[PDB]
């Protein structure tokens, strides 16, 4: 009864963990997200993996999961493990609100989920969670935030994020087009449109294959704007006219 | 048994207590301290069943220190008060209840001062001036006579002087010395110990 | 080729306990000597770095006010057992108003020297030298990972125990004194250690019926070493 | 009794196209009042309130528990909650403590989320629902508010006569009561907007 | 649950996972720490940041009490777990005995947890190595390190992370008592040791000190720049 | 600018970029190699 | 509360009165004690209301589950066995005075359940506080194998006598008829009481009450 | 039961869940099916061949109701199908206990997908070899939800699962549209089932259930025999 045992916890004799890296290489496929925090708001971007013509789009949601009033998360990896994670995460934030009657700050939420993931990395032989996922949100102490979960339990705040293997060049692009706090909400959207236009190899970026949701700060509302498709269309037209204006320099 | 008063101001909180430790019929200790510093701007006093007071200080005090050391910053007074109410409300319907009756005193940078008010049945309250005990009765008329929401702190000290002068006038108890704190934007300031010379 | 950890041998022994007896051998040496005046004991610290502050390494730890000890090899597996042995001696003096004798201490330890298993994990990796003065005079005791506990009159352990036992049987007899045994131990030490013998390398622990508690502060070690 | 430990009165009244819920403000320990700003009517989403009366411990506890389950439900399903669903949720939450009962009498008053249909109901301390068309009451001074609403109610009511009727009912039924007084808060809601008025009650 | 023994002894007398989980420490960031006599100093090198993002979340130096300070190496998640448990333990000690928590107690707790963690049924050993610097009662600066085996072990200066042999060789030829005379010089000594370590651009040089009657102060990376500048000035004055 | 680019580049990546930039150079009949040659070579070697 | 049941020549006639008293005060004038179990089996409750409600909803859930698992019509004896086993497991703490009726393949079957777990099969039962009067009316004017309208008149007469006698009874009278094919359910059967129209319009005016603090919050 | 509790599910060297890929292959080796949503109702249809002429068609049922308004078919192995059907049964009744309201189909698919995903993580157990097609008419708009062994789920306008799902799907892309009636849905469903089955398709080789807004309805072999006049 031990020769069948798969040993997904014991270190490898190369020097690192073994199953952890392969969960990372399971992150690398089927997924490509980022967001752009650079004032008054923060956004998320997403690629349709099932962009087939025979779906319904009746969920009024996609990759985004509004997990509270003031936080959502973008998924990349195996989807339904993340549903297990979103249910547990939503329930964690809601029990915190039950305990204090004040909304949940974003880093102890992230560290709670990171301790859950490390709890299945550390002991037993259980299969690790093959899900990395993002975080947007608001607090009383820092404003708008961005966080990067990893299947190890390691996290890290960013100002311009990355999950999927197609988006490492996006991080190169985010550095080459880095701004010091300039999110008028049209500049950041045009930059995100430019990034997803270049990094995905889908020619000219059909707007049904993308997804953009924003989070702005209102006094009593903290609205999360999972925006509709027409503004995405005119955003694509704006960016393609600006690419035609930009290649007048040749 | 006794009562410790908690007068709230515009931008300060005036809390006080006794130095009295009851027994069978004897006053065992005449320099007792009921003050439990939760954080840099949140105090806590406790009166009730006298075995539960120290352990409440243990539970609440140490879990607030855990939050402060974990996340990097101080609680609001409101969330701390609600957390105390939650642990009371959970501890009520069991085989082991706690019997305490104390109000909570905090100060936010944004919300400013805040006064809360418990009971032995875990009820929250947001009060301008509150009370418990038997000194409650003889003192809230005097306090509700001379109250102005925009009152200065030396007037509050004089009002507390007056309130004590009506505590030593028609009471069946001793109550010789009272300690007095104040909370401001600067933190915890200890005022002088308020006694009367007897002989 | 990974078998079950609770498998005996084709020859008979076990495996993992035998590998524990192998795992003793890398550790540092130690020498204890029973004398009727009292039990003396010595050890080597094996100081590695000058950045390594020397007075913090524990080899002789204290079980009771009259029961001493020394550890070997792995440090922290020994620390658990030292803590628990102390607890059980405190239980004996409490429920009995008397001193748990050293044999009863070591019976209580080697009751769970091997309770290693998957339910109800690995075997421990430390050799222990137990001393003290009970009612039966001085006692010197030695256990192993396998729980095979025996009395020894002057046992030497660990990495240099071959020449230590041999040259110890050269010098030892029944009617030794205390200080003669102390310098007789540290001669063997500075034949089996690698570094120069000085004030910081070794540490002693002697417990007597007269010198009632095991007490050994620094710089009487200087007076003992300059007597060589 | 344990119901008469802190006083309390919650009235809900169905109008023509709108619904009005009101409660008292007083908080205190059997004969000693404490404050005049204790909240007993909670918002549960838009155009739907709940009122809680009885022992204040169970008031705040059940309000936070219900807010917990309510936000979990509205996050598991993107739509907002129907009032019968909320009634059944409160019934299940109270009935989980069948032998460890809370001391509260919840009153739900809200509009339809799809239409402008009003809705009122009340529950007992073990989870007995009761839907009516005119009014439900809860607290110590039951018989007073019963006399008022069976005296003054009309079926088809514009919000102004609704407001004045529930105003006179609450004022008179509270003034005959002893342990419950010290101000009245009134929520008069409709399809378009939500109005909150406070009345000039006797502060005695 | 999981009835198995992960860590078996070797045929030649080892624990594979205790000796081998030190490699994960060996392939992490470098961090040094010395004690002066009145001011304590430590800091990590090799943040290896993206130079264009947040940095308040990647902080490798934290505290458990107002008296004690952290550092670690290896992978960061196990450090996060151990720090959470250590905070709980030190505050629970404050619950009981009314002292500030002694550093020796919290190091014994961490090492004891680590050893009973390696001993137990199927729990993977912690591949970290922490540094626990604090100055308890009567102002005595002390500093201990940990190990995946679970051996708290008091030192005078640090050698962990990547290339710790080189760093300890520099501290070996730099054990001058003169270096711990001037607090500023001790700070500069940490800067020079970490300068004899990695790039040390003055970007990944994250250092924090405690003057033993205050709390930890994280230094703003302009003061560290002037420290590196005066170190380069003294290096020019050497010729 | 190129050292900072990849955190774990080897000499293989360096040879690949230093030759692909030359292949971009002789694509347009030039001798000297500008910065955007290295940019295109970086975006050709690494992320494809 | 006075519920009754009877078995005529083909099926079951159930009745109810919809005054939900709370102590001494009429708390409701229109309630519903005849509950759903299955498309053929119904139930009436008495005594503690919420206990009857939660118990009948649990048993209705379990029998819907069992019937959908099987693929046929439920049996009444299964409902009886589940109810008596549950109520005996609660040791008579839960007060649920139930009348159980349904039509199986075997035909009509009426059961009454007393809240400890004692059950009886009867042709006619009465339960509640004023059940004694309706049982008197039944024993006065019962004959075996009645027809439909006879049984309806009898049950209406019985619950009517219970309403004109009992103090916790009295409202408009619920009826329910179960056959092999036809299920009917009729709330306002013979509404006995009128109410006098008001003699003074005591209507207030737009502003007769002093207002201290207003608020307006718009919506969509 | 013994203390093992270890998941036999391991990522690949590449990063792939080999037991889920194999479970998808085991789904693909099963009996074909098709299900179509068409403005007023949802039609499910399976393909139920007896092995011999001996077998009975009144014993085993593919189309199976979960509530009074929620149908459910599969394409995989019946022995796992009945287990997770029974689980969905028990699960829907807890919702109806809590809220006293019939459960929405999206909430069913959430909870069933949570169960199946949570079970493929769980230790010493294989995944299910079953892909579902869940449907129902909740709150006016009818729905259609396909799940899979990997725990995921989707929402389709028309789809297929089983043998020749690619061929049936290419027939569905051409054939279906936005708006049809229930009869036309049955027409295109029996057409695409007739794409892959054997030549003799009778009142028993197929087994068809529909959904109305008035509730779920499971059609009989009577109307199935009525329908294959001017067949497909």
Curated annotation (Swiss-Prot), chain C:
The modification Phosphoserine is found at residues 9, 49, 56. It is found in: Cytoplasm; Nucleus. Gene3D superfamilies: Glutamine Phosphoribosylpyrophosphate, subunit 1, domain 1 (3.60.20.10). Its main location: cytoplasm. GO terms for biological process: proteasome-mediated ubiquitin-dependent protein catabolic process. Keywords: Acetylation, Cytoplasm, Glycoprotein, Nucleus, Phosphoprotein, Proteasome. The modification Phosphothreonine is found at residue 48. It comes from the Eukaryota. SMART domains: Proteasome_A_N. SUPFAM superfamilies: N-terminal nucleophile aminohydrolases (Ntn hydrolases). Expressed in fetal brain (at protein level). Glycans are attached at residue 185. The keyword Nucleus applies. Induction: Up-regulated in colon cancer cell lines. Up-regulated in fetal Down syndrome (DS) brain (at protein level). May be the target of the transcriptional activator NFE2L2. Coiled coil: none annotated. InterPro entries: Ntn_hydrolases_N, Proteasome_alpha, Proteasome_alpha-type, Proteasome_alpha_type_5, Proteasome_asu_N, Proteasome_sua/b. It holds the Pfam family Proteasome. The keyword Nucleus applies. One of its GO terms (cellular component) is proteasome core complex. Belongs to the peptidase T1A family. The 26S proteasome consists of a 20S proteasome core and two 19S regulatory subunits. The 20S proteasome core is a barrel-shaped complex made of 28 subunits that are arranged in four stacked rings. The two outer rings are each formed by seven alpha subunits, and the two inner rings are formed by seven beta subunits. The proteolytic activity is exerted by three beta-subunits PSMB5, PSMB6 and PSMB7. PSMA5 interacts directly with the PSMG1-PSMG2 heterodimer which promotes 20S proteasome assembly. The gene is PSMA5.
From Swiss-Prot, chain D:
Non-catalytic component of the 20S core proteasome complex involved in the proteolytic degradation of most intracellular proteins. This complex plays numerous essential roles within the cell by associating with different regulatory particles. Associated with two 19S regulatory particles, forms the 26S proteasome and thus participates in the ATP-dependent degradation of ubiquitinated proteins. The modification N-acetylserine is found at residue 1. Keywords: Acetylation, Cytoplasm, Host-virus interaction, Nucleus, Proteasome. The gene is PSMB3. It comes from the Eukaryota. One of its GO terms (cellular component) is proteasome complex. GO terms for biological process: proteasome-mediated ubiquitin-dependent protein catabolic process. This is Proteasome subunit beta type-3.
Curated annotation (Swiss-Prot), chain E:
Induction: Down-regulated by the ribozyme Rz3'X. Up-regulated in colorectal cancer tissues. Changing residue 111 to D: Found in patient with severe intellectual disability; uncertain significance. Belongs to the peptidase T1A family. This is Proteasome subunit alpha type-7. Component of the 20S core proteasome complex involved in the proteolytic degradation of most intracellular proteins. This complex plays numerous essential roles within the cell by associating with different regulatory particles. Associated with two 19S regulatory particles, forms the 26S proteasome and thus participates in the ATP-dependent degradation of ubiquitinated proteins. It comes from Homo sapiens (Human). The modification Phosphotyrosine is found at residue 152. It comes from the Eukaryota. The keyword Phosphoprotein applies. The lineage of its organism: Eukaryota, Metazoa, Chordata, Craniata, Vertebrata. The gene is PSMA7. GO terms for biological process: proteasome-mediated ubiquitin-dependent protein catabolic process. Keywords: Acetylation, Cytoplasm, Glycoprotein, Host-virus interaction, Nucleus, Phosphoprotein, Proteasome. The modification N6-acetyllysine is found at residue 226. Glycans are attached at residue 129. It is found in: Cytoplasm; Nucleus. Phosphorylation by ABL1 or ABL2 leads to an inhibition of proteasomal activity and cell cycle transition blocks. One of its GO terms (cellular component) is cytosol. GO terms for molecular function: identical protein binding. It holds the Pfam family Proteasome_A_N. InterPro entries: Ntn_hydrolases_N (IPR029055), Proteasome_alpha (IPR050115), Proteasome_alpha-type (IPR023332), Proteasome_asu_N (IPR000426), Proteasome_sua/b (IPR001353).
From Swiss-Prot, chain H:
The modification Phosphotyrosine is found at residues 4, 22, 74, 119. SMART domains: Proteasome_A_N. InterPro entries: Ntn_hydrolases_N, Proteasome_alpha, Proteasome_alpha-type, Proteasome_asu_N, Proteasome_sua/b. Its main location: cytoplasm. It comes from the Eukaryota. Keywords: Acetylation, Cytoplasm, Nucleus, Phosphoprotein, Proteasome. One of its GO terms (cellular component) is proteasome complex. Induction: Down-regulated by antioxidants BO-653 and probucol. Down-regulated in response to enterovirus 71 (EV71) infection (at protein level). It is found in: Cytoplasm; Nucleus. The modification Phosphoserine is found at residues 5, 12, 14. The modification N6-acetyllysine is found at residues 68, 169. One of its GO terms (biological process) is proteasome-mediated ubiquitin-dependent protein catabolic process. Gene3D superfamilies: Glutamine Phosphoribosylpyrophosphate, subunit 1, domain 1 (3.60.20.10). Phosphorylated on tyrosine residues; which may be important for nuclear import. CDD domains: proteasome_alpha_type_2. Belongs to the peptidase T1A family. Component of the 20S core proteasome complex involved in the proteolytic degradation of most intracellular proteins. This complex plays numerous essential roles within the cell by associating with different regulatory particles. Associated with two 19S regulatory particles, forms the 26S proteasome and thus participates in the ATP-dependent degradation of ubiquitinated proteins. This is Proteasome subunit alpha type-2. It comes from Homo sapiens (Human). The gene is PSMA2.
């Amino acid at each position: 009864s031990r020769r069948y045992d798969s040993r997904t916890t014991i270190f490898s004799p190369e020097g690192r963990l073994y199953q952890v890296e392969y969960a990372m290489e399971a992150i690398g496929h089927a997924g490509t997200c980022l967001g752009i925090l650079a004032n008054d708001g923060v956004l998320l971007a997403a690629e349709r993996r099932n962009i087939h013509k025979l779906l319904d789009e009746v969920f009024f949601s996609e990759k985004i999961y509004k997990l509270n009033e003031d936080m959502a998360c973008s998924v990349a990896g195996i989807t339904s493990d993340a549903n297990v994670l979103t249910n547990e995460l939503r329930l964690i934030a809601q029990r915190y609100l039950l305990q204090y009657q004040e909304p949940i700050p974003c880093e102890q939420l992230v560290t709670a989920l990171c301790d859950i993931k490390q709890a299945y990395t550390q002991f037993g032989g259980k299969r690790p969670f093959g899900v990395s996922l993002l975080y947007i949100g608001w607090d009383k102490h820092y404003g708008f935030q961005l966080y990067q979960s990893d299947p190890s339990g390691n996290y890290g705040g960013w100002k311009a994020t990355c999950i999927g293997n197609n988006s490492a060049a996006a991080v190169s692009m985010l550095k080459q087009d880095y701004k010091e706090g300039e999110m008028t909400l049209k500049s950041a959207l045009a930059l995100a449109i430019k990034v997803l236009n270049k990094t995905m190899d889908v020619s000219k970026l059909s707007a049904e294959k993308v997804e953009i949701a924003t989070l702005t700060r209102e006094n009593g509302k903290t609205v999360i704007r999972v925006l509709k498709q027409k503004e995405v269309e005119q955003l694509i037209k704006k960016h393609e006219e600006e690419e035609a204006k930009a290649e007048r320099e040749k | 048994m006794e009562y410790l008063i908690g007068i709230q101001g515009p931008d300060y909180v005036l809390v006080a207590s006794d130095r009295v430790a009851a027994s069978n019929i004897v006053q065992m200790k005449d320099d007792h301290d009921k003050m439990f510093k939760m954080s840099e701007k949140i105090l806590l006093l406790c009166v009730g069943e006298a075995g539960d007071t120290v352990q409440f200080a243990e539970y609440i005090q140490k879990n607030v220190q855990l939050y402060k050391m974990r996340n990097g910053y101080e609680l609001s007074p409101t969330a701390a008060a609600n957390f105390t109410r939650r642990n009371l409300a959970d501890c009520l319907r069991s085989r082991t209840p706690y019997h305490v009756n104390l109000l909570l005193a905090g100060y936010d940078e944004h919300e400013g001062p805040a006064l809360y008010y418990m009971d032995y049945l875990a009820a929250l309250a947001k009060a301008p001036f509150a009370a418990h005990g038997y000194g409650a009765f003889l003192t809230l008329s005097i306090l509700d006579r001379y109250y102005t929401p925009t009152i200065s702190r030396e007037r509050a000290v004089e009002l507390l002087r007056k309130c004590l002068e009506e505590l030593q006038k028609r009471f069946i108890l001793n109550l010789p010395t009272f300690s007095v704190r104040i909370i401001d934007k600067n933190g915890i300031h200890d005022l002088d110990n308020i006694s009367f010379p007897k002989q | 080729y990974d078998r079950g950890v609770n498998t005996f041998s084709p020859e008979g022994r076990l495996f993992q306990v035998e590998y524990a007896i192998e795992a003793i051998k890398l550790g540092s040496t130690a020498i204890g000597i029973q004398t009727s005046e009292g039990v003396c004991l010595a050890v080597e610290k094996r100081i590695t770095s000058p950045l390594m502050e020397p007075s913090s390494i524990e080899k002789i730890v204290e079980i009771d006010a009259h029961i001493g000890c020394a550890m070997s090899g792995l440090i922290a597996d020994a620390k658990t057992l030292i803590d628990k042995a102390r607890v059980e001696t405190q239980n004996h003096w409490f429920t009995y108003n008397e001193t748990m004798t050293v044999e009863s201490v070591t019976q209580a330890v080697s009751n769970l020297a091997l309770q290693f298993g998957e339910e109800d994990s690995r075997p421990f990796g430390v050799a222990l030298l137990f001393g003290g003065v009970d009612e039966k005079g001085p006692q010197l005791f030695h256990m192993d990972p396998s729980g095979t506990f025996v009395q020894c009159d002057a046992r030497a352990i660990g990495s240099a125990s071959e020449g230590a036992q041999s040259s110890l049987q050269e010098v030892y007899h029944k009617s030794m004194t205390l200080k003669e045994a102390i310098k007789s131990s540290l001669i063997i030490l500075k034949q089996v250690m690698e570094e120069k013998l000085n004030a910081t390398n070794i540490e002693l622990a002697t417990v007597q019926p007269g010198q009632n508690f095991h007490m050994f502060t620094k710089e009487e070690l200087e007076e003992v070493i300059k007597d060589i | 009794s344990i119901m008469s430990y802190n006083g309390g009165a919650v009235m809900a009244m169905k109008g023509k196209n709108c619904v009005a819920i009101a409660a008292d403000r007083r908080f205190g320990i059997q004969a000693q009042m404490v404050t005049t700003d204790f909240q007993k009517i909670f918002p549960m989403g838009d155009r739907l309130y709940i009122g809680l009366a009885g022992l204040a411990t169970d008031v705040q506890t059940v309000a936070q528990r219900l807010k917990f389950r309510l936000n979990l439900y509205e996050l598991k399903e993107g739509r907002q909650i129907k009032p019968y669903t909320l009634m059944s949720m409160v019934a299940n939450l109270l009935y989980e403590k069948r032998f460890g009962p809370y001391y509260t009498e919840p009153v739900i008053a809200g509009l339809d989320p799809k239409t402008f249909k009003p809705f009122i109901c009340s529950l007992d301390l073990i989870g007995c629902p009761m839907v009516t068309d005119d009014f439900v009451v809860s607290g110590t001074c039951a018989e007073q508010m019963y006399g008022m609403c069976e005296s003054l109610w009309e079926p088809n009511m514009d919000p102004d006569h609704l407001f004045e009727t529930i105003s006179q009912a609450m004022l008179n039924a509270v003034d005959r009561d002893a342990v419950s007084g010290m101000g009245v808060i009134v929520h008069i809601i409709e399809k378009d907007k939500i109005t909150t008025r406070t009345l000039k009650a006797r502060m005695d | 649950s999981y009835d198995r023994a992960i860590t078996v002894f070797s045929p030649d007398g080892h624990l594979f996972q205790v000796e081998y989980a030190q490699e994960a420490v060996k392939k992490g960031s470098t961090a040094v720490g010395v004690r002066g006599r009145d001011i304590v100093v430590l800091g990590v090198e090799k943040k290896s940041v993206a130079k264009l993002q947040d940095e308040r979340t990647v902080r490798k130096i934290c505290a458990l009490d107002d008296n004690v300070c952290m550092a670690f190496a290896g992978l960061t998640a196990d450090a996060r777990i151990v720090i959470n448990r250590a905070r709980v333990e030190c505050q629970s000690h404050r619950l009981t005995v009314e002292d500030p928590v002694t550093v020796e107690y919290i190091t014994r707790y961490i090492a004891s947890l680590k050893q009973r963690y390696t001993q137990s049924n199927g729990r993977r050993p912690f591949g970290i190595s922490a540094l626990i610097v604090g100055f308890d009662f009567d102002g005595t600066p002390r500093l201990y390190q940990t190990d995946p085996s679970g051996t708290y072990h008091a030192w005078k200066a640090n050698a962990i992370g990547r290339g710790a042999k080189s760093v300890r060789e520099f501290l070996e030829k730099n054990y001058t008592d003169e270096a711990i005379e001037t607090d500023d010089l001790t700070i500069k000594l940490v800067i020079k040791a970490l300068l004899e370590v990695v790039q040390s651009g003055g970007k990944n040089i994250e250092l924090a000190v405690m003057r033993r009657d205050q709390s930890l102060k994280i230094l703003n990376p302009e003061e560290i720049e002037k420290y590196v500048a005066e170190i380069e000035k003294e290096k020019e004055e050497n010729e | 600018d190129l050292i900072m680019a990849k955190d774990d580049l080897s000499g293989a990546d360096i040879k690949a970029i230093c030759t692909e930039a030359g292949l971009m150079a002789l694509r347009e009949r030039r001798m000297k190699v500008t910065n955007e040659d290295f940019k295109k070579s970086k975006e050709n070697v690494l992320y494809k | 509360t006075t519920i009754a049941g009877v078995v005529y020549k083909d099926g079951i006639v159930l009745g109810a009165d919809t005054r939900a008293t709370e102590g001494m005060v009429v708390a409701d004038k229109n309630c519903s004690k005849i509950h759903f179990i299955s498309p053929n089996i119904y139930c009436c409750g008495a005594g503690t209301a919420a206990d009857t409600d939660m118990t009948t909803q649990l048993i209705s859930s379990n029998l819907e589950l069992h019937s959908l698992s099987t693929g046929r019509l439920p049996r009444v004896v299964t409902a009886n066995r589940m109810l008596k086993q549950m109520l005996f497991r609660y040791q008579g703490y839960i007060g649920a005075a139930l009348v159980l009726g349904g039509v199986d393949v075997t035909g009509p079957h009426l059961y009454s359940i007393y809240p400890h777990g004692s059950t009886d099969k009867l042709p006619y039962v009465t339960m509640g506080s004023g059940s004694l009067a309706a049982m008197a009316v039944f024993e006065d004017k019962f004959r075996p194998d009645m027809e439909e309208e006879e049984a309806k008149n009898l049950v209406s007469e019985a619950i009517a006598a219970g309403i004109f006698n009992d103090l916790g009874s009295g409202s408009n009278i619920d009826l329910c008829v179960i056959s092999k094919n036809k299920l009917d359910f009729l709330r306002p059967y013979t509404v006995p009481n009128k109410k006098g129209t008001r003699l003074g319009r005591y209507r207030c005016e737009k502003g007769t009450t002093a207002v201290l603090t207003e608020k307006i919050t718009p919506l969509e | 039961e013994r203390g093992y509790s270890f998941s036999l599910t391991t990522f690949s060297p590449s990063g792939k869940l080999v037991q889920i890929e194999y479970a998808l292959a085991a789904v693909a080796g099963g009996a074909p099916s098709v299900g179509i949503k068409a403005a007023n109702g949802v039609v499910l249809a399976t393909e139920k061949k007896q092995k011999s002429i001996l077998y009975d068609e009144r014993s085993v049922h593919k189309v199976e109701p979960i509530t009074k308004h929620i149908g459910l078919v599969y394409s995989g192995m019946g022995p796992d199908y009945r287990v997770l059907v029974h689980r969905a049964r028990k699960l829907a009744q807890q919702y109806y206990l809590v809220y006293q309201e019939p459960i929405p189909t999206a909430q069913l698919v959430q909870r069933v997908a949570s169960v199946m995903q949570e079970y493929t993580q769980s230790g010493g157990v294989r995944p299910f070899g079953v892909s579902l097609l869940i449907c129902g008419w909740n709150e006016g708009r009818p729905y259609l939800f396909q799940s899979d062994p990997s725990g995921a789920y989707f929402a389709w306008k028309a789809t297929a699962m089983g043998k020749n799902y690619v061929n049936g799907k290419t027939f569905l892309e051409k054939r279906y549209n936005e708006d049809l009636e229930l009869e036309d849905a049955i027409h295109t469903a029996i057409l695409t089932l007739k794409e892959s089955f054997e030549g003799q398709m009778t009142e028993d080789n197929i087994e068809v259930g529909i959904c109305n807004e008035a509730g779920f309805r499971r059609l009989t072999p009577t109307e199935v025999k009525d329908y294959l006049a001017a067949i497909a």
